[PDB]
């Protein structure tokens, strides 16, 4: 927070890249698969483009540049970096394509080949990623398996900071307006009085790992997203995943404590899951573990 920032925001024109096919749709704009041939050099790097819907206000235009600022400013193996930005009436955000799609989709598909070593590695990485975002005063606000993308099955990264918010010199929290938010992923305070801290994200981490440990299940399925805070204040919580060791669930439980200050800290979570990563079959019990693959550990980017 004192060194020269020096990030390179590459600005690009809409001729440099063409959209091949759509990946995500929604009122939260459209996101396409495309190719980016930078002006000159004869390379076609495959990218993701997010062409979010037309801005409707100058206030809600200034925030777009903001999402671009940070996404462009971060530098971590497990966090996605903004590759370029295209400033047309409709702003477009260009980013290195993660070809395998999101983790939530990946776990559902290969939900039969995924073994314990992989699951625990993913937890670790996601926490390495978030801890990073913490050492930058950054508050994700939307951690879910849908927002964790797969570069390669052995390497995942966090993405989509549509809601990300920097913290000023003396600031221990963030208060929001009234946009859209995924109640089933939020800490009780977030649902109560729109508060967002790093600890609020930790609760999201837990729901995310829960999502993974259950191979894609919908959290609190069938239960309408209106009375979540009741059951939550009542003390209910997502059930222990069948394959899940008490040792692991107990971490997910600590993550969902009404008291923000009793939830783990990403710093701790890393070391904990890292420890668990060694000797994984002790912490996750999945039929067929002895079988599942391990990670022995036209032109892509990185150029
Ligand atoms: C049976 C599985 N099926 C086909 C394979 N995938 C499809 C898929 C592939 C890639 C992606 C993908 C999205 C994405 C992505 N999207 C995020 C929201 C984004 C962030 C900033 C700018 C643009 C996009 N960013 C980077 N790489 C990405 N890759 C999404 C879905 C899962 C669905």
Swiss-Prot record:
Major localization class: membrane
Active-site residues, Swiss-Prot/TrEMBL: 142 (proton acceptor)
UniProt binding sites for ATP: 23-31, 50, 95-96, 160
Effect upon mutating residue 138 to V: Found in a lung cancer sample; more sensitive to gefitinib than wild-type
Expression across tissues: Ubiquitously expressed. Isoform 2 is also expressed in ovarian cancers.
Annotated effect of mutating residue 10 to A: Abolishes phosphorylation
Modified residues annotated as Phosphotyrosine in this record: 174
Illness association: Lung cancer: A common malignancy affecting tissues of the lung. The most common form of lung cancer is non-small cell lung cancer (NSCLC) that can be divided into 3 major histologic subtypes: squamous cell carcinoma, adenocarcinoma, and large cell lung cancer. NSCLC is often diagnosed at an advanced stage and has a poor prognosis. Neonatal nephrocutaneous inflammatory syndrome: An autosomal recessive disorder characterized by intrauterine growth retardation, premature birth, fragile skin, recurrent skin infections and sepsis, failure to thrive, nephrocalcinosis, and nephromegaly with tubular dysfunction. Some patients have chronic diarrhea, and necrotizing enterocolitis.
Function: Receptor tyrosine kinase binding ligands of the EGF family and activating several signaling cascades to convert extracellular cues into appropriate cellular responses. Known ligands include EGF, TGFA/TGF-alpha, AREG, epigen/EPGN, BTC/betacellulin, epiregulin/EREG and HBEGF/heparin-binding EGF. Ligand binding triggers receptor homo- and/or heterodimerization and autophosphorylation on key cytoplasmic residues. The phosphorylated receptor recruits adapter proteins like GRB2 which in turn activates complex downstream signaling cascades. Isoform 2 may act as an antagonist of EGF action.
Protein name stated in the entry: Epidermal growth factor receptor
Annotated source species: Homo sapiens
Span of the entire protein shown here: 696 to 1015 of 1210
């Amino acid at each position: 927070g004192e060194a020269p920032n020096q990030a390179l925001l590459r600005i690009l024109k809409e001729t440099e890249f063409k959209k091949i096919k759509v990946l995500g749709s929604g009122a939260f704009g459209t996101v396409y698969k495309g190719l980016w041939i930078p002006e000159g050099e004869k390379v076609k790097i495959p990218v993701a483009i997010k062409e979010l819907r037309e801005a409707t206000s100058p206030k809600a235009n200034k925030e777009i540049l903001d999402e671009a600022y940070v996404m462009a400013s971060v530098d971590n193996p497990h966090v996605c970096r903004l590759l370029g930005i295209c400033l047309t009436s409709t702003v477009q955000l260009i980013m290195q394509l993660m070809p395998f799609g999101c983790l939530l989709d990946y776990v559902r598909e290969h939900k039969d080949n995924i073994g314990s070593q992989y699951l625990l590695n993913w937890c670790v990485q996601i926490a390495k990623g978030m801890n990073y975002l913490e050492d930058r005063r950054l508050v994700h606000r939307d951690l879910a398996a849908r927002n964790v993308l797969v570069k390669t099955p052995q390497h995942v990264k966090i993405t989509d900071f549509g809601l990300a918010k920097l913290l000023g010199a003396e600031e221990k929290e963030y208060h929001a307006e009234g946009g859209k938010v995924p109640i089933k992923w939020m800490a009780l305070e977030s649902i109560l009085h729109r508060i967002y801290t790093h600890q609020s994200d930790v609760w999201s981490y837990g729901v995310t790992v829960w999502e993974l440990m259950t191979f894609g299940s919908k959290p609190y399925d069938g239960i309408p997203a209106s009375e979540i805070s009741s059951i939550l204040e009542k003390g209910e919580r997502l059930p222990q995943p069948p394959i899940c060791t008490i040792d692991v669930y107990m971490i997910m439980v600590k993550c969902w404590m009404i008291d923000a200050d009793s939830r783990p800290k990403f710093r701790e979570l890393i070391i904990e899951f890292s420890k668990m990563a060694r000797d994984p079959q002790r912490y996750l019990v999945i039929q067929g573990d002895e079988r599942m693959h391990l990670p022995s550990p036209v032109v892509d980017a990185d150029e």
